[PDB]
């Protein structure tokens, strides 16, 4: 595994947040989403009935994996991570296990994870995946229902509106039927997976944590796994903003990575125009790389599946400043 | 016609700019539209082939004429004007003459002009219409091709990219086949039409100007017609920002937007403050001018959050001031 | 003390953040301050030599206590709290103990705390005070030097740049010579003090905490004291955003800003909408919590245009809702 | 005069808008200025009594000609133009003719035009000047009083509030006593003047127009004069946005220049955060230079005499993109 050595020198990567939440764009019935526009279903407790129907409008005419990767490559990013399934429970790939997915449920009728995976392979970029293994608002036994004693970017961590029976909920049902199967699907198809990013488990047993680890190992041996998953079930540690240099779970390979956004939201949002300046993006990348931390910078694709104009402008301007500085 | 008397005391009205241009939202291939996001097809000379295909994505799940009118009524607006067909040539009604329309060409498969017309009738608001009688970028013989000696919010006034033959163009073909017929359609259906707003003709004969006037008169007698159409072919005059302080009825109206674009746009967040909207309305009404304030509906057919907030805040300030 | 009963029904109050930090306006040598523009001295570790010199530029021509209070009263705010001295150590009153103050050190040469105190009295508003009893970046033995094991809105909690000798620092020197004396000054002059807001002590002994409590009690008996000061040394509790849905009187209050900064800042245009301000006030008042909404005065001592607009628009919506 | 040849290859220049209007910052008594924050005195018809008093607050601690020029030079700008006196009538130099100036009337007590002129000389940049030869709101017989039949960025073109006697006004009084003398002062001192930018005359006789031309010629022979001044009294033509390629006064030397701002205001303004993107600044410069037009890009200094943070960021980012493009 010299995939470890490559990750040491990778430095820069593109993250993609895309789903049904992108269509609403941080706006619901004349009122604003939280800082996080992807959390909008939980924020307004939108019935799966209504939220799911967004799938019927999902027809991103200007989606183009080739261009998205081409941009990423031109900004010097060596890998591309993408959301296979967020908390909303909607898969952005052709899931055999659940028909609540982009291919089956939308007019678009195309596997986005597939196109990106291929585009990356052809452009010579590594391909990473992200999957919400705990939270699933579409699933009756969705995770988080025994972990609401803290506030969120929405309301509850689980779907407490469609399924108001915390006392008679059992995540084991959700894990065996959707989670473990869907993780197999994405790790089986879409060629070589170089990175796998998971959420901090809240309603997940140690068995279920170890299960996923083994599942990824058996299917994608060379795949580097994120620390969020389990304390003895990772390769590289994900540092979360407040864990950045001027408790700490040991990194035995000495691999570190920090996910960040260009504006204040991961999912796309009309009202969020607070785009980090070219200078800020370059300077933060510089700081993280100097402390041996990979910078995973997120683009939130819009309803037509385009990179927001200002997101592109600033990504390219940040590259220019970096290049100009490396000659000076 | 006491429709004249009502227009004198109308004061406030809602304008709706909605079409395929709303889906792009002032953004095309990583580059920004002009101040006017509705002019985006001309701005980037987008082939009718590509631009038209936007119709396939047009599925506004959260469109609701009832609510849009309810908002308008709550802000004190007495009439609602809507775009039947803009310069893009795409009809937002069920046009028998052209299949390039919301009902036939989109998954949505619904007559928006119809729903709004009905919603207005039931809510007790008058219903106005707007139609681009000159410019049509979808039509081979689209107007503006003999009037490019001045700059626009796009490139050329006409579709000079799909149809680059200015020398062998003839608008008479476009007028007889699409324009006059489509004006009949909207003025025939959708109940009583109280106002009709037209563009300044550039490539339109006096005959064609008088034709439309007579067509509207014959179909909608009570309908008040905008001055833009023709010098002896109107009831009320439209003042254009720089004309703010002959109308034989003594009727005047000024169209304005909440931000800087008529059509919806992501990057345009320059929403006029509640205070500005109220103060401008106050000024225009005090000089006997009707304020037609435009909402540019987004891809899901929603009133932009900040557009709603400011419209309602502007009403509050007006109400608070009328008690004080 | 029916000052307790009044605080129960007070509901709305104005907060004022003003000092030398207001002149820089979240900007230093081509680079941005934190979310908190008042913390700018710590953020860039600006020498007291340089930062203090800002006093020479402090000449706010358009400062007017009368108008500031008049605005507050028109928005329905029943009391006005003001910064006597922030972490920067610069007093905004005529301090006999330290010449590092607005009256002595500036061309302005006027006691701002005085004018506001008077303006409030004449307008029929209660007058509150805020004093940084722990942190003082101007003082050699400024507090926070044994509490840097956590991150701030600047760099260190103390002035670690002018005075880099944490090992040979002693806060007792600072407390006896500046803090206790200056607290006496503000609580002695400027008429009746109805509220007193203090910071969470980090480098303050229980003795020093009790000292301040007794000092305020002896000088301003009717004055309600904030919970931040000491666990058995308050009347009302200050809830800090994340504490929103023991107080023996059953009194609670939450401080908030209109944008994301307390001190004024050019680049911070993220003004909470009229709707947001009203709705948050409504929520807090419904849960028996007083809303203390902060205005950060600009270099000329003006209420920022958008701060005023939104405060008045928020009042309008509240009034409109109380009739509806 | 090979000053003509240098102007042909100059391409990029910095403009400085600074005065009493900068202290108000597009804000007066809770209400906003026009697009133009420098026009604020006319906008709210602020008495000379009140407006003039701003001089007492003018103490820009962080003003530094060296740094301003250093920035300009680093962005590749070959000359720096500055406002000696705008419409407000307030001179930013040590005027012997009028005590309504930065040196005499302010705590600052320093000649800004001087420091910049020197800073430019030492850094190896040419030095240009701008003077409002027609409009003067401080002068009783200020110009514009017979030209109010059109709307402005304020109210009237002249000071119609302090001096409401259009019928008994005579500009000849203003020209002989302030204008011609003050133009001599700035063209006599502050070393070599390479460029001189004037306003379109509205209330100025042909004699008075020719007078200024001759005055500049006699004092600064090598100085290139702007077309705005007079039809037979210039070297290079100033194109005003709507005169840019995809009536036209002939340019005999073939010299063209276009003034533009980074945001929508010339003078500094708090509420105007509409900063043209790095991409826009570079692309516009590219377009103008390709059509043989010099790009004069304006910085509006703030109350402390600093280049606004975002103005600097975008100027430097625009340089980076230009440099990156000239290697690619």
Numbering used by the authors:
A (entry chain A), D (entry chain A): 2 to 247, 264 to 345
B (entry chain C), C (entry chain C): 2 to 246, 267 to 345
Question: Which sentences from the paper describe this structure?
Answer:
Lactobacillus casei produces a GH29A α-fucosidase, AlfC, that is ~104-fold more active on α(1-6)-fucosyl linkages compared to other linkages. This enzyme is particularly relevant because α(1-6) linkages form the basis of human core fucosylation, which significantly impacts the function of glycoproteins such as antibodies. AlfC is a single-domain enzyme that adopts a (β/α)8 fold typical of GH29 enzymes, with an active site at the center of the barrel.
The mutation of a glutamic acid residue at position 274 to alanine (AlfCE274A) has been shown to convert AlfC from a hydrolase into an efficient transfucosidase that can transfer a fucose moiety to an acceptor (e.g., N-acetylglucosamine [GlcNAc]) from a simple fucosyl donor (e.g., α-fucosyl fluoride) with nearly quantitative yields. We solved the X-ray crystal structures of both of these enzymes. They exhibited no major conformational changes compared to AlfCWT, with CαRMSD < 0.25 Å for each of the enzymes. These residues interact to mediate open and closed conformations in MD simulations, with these results consistent with AlfCE274A sampling more open conformations. The marked perturbation in R229 provides a potential rationale for the azide rescue seen with AlfCE274A, if azide ions occupy the E274A cavity to stabilize R229 and promote closed conformations. The HDX-MS analysis suggests that AlfCE274A and AlfCN243A are transfucosidase mutants that work by shifting the dynamic equilibrium of AlfC toward a more open conformation.
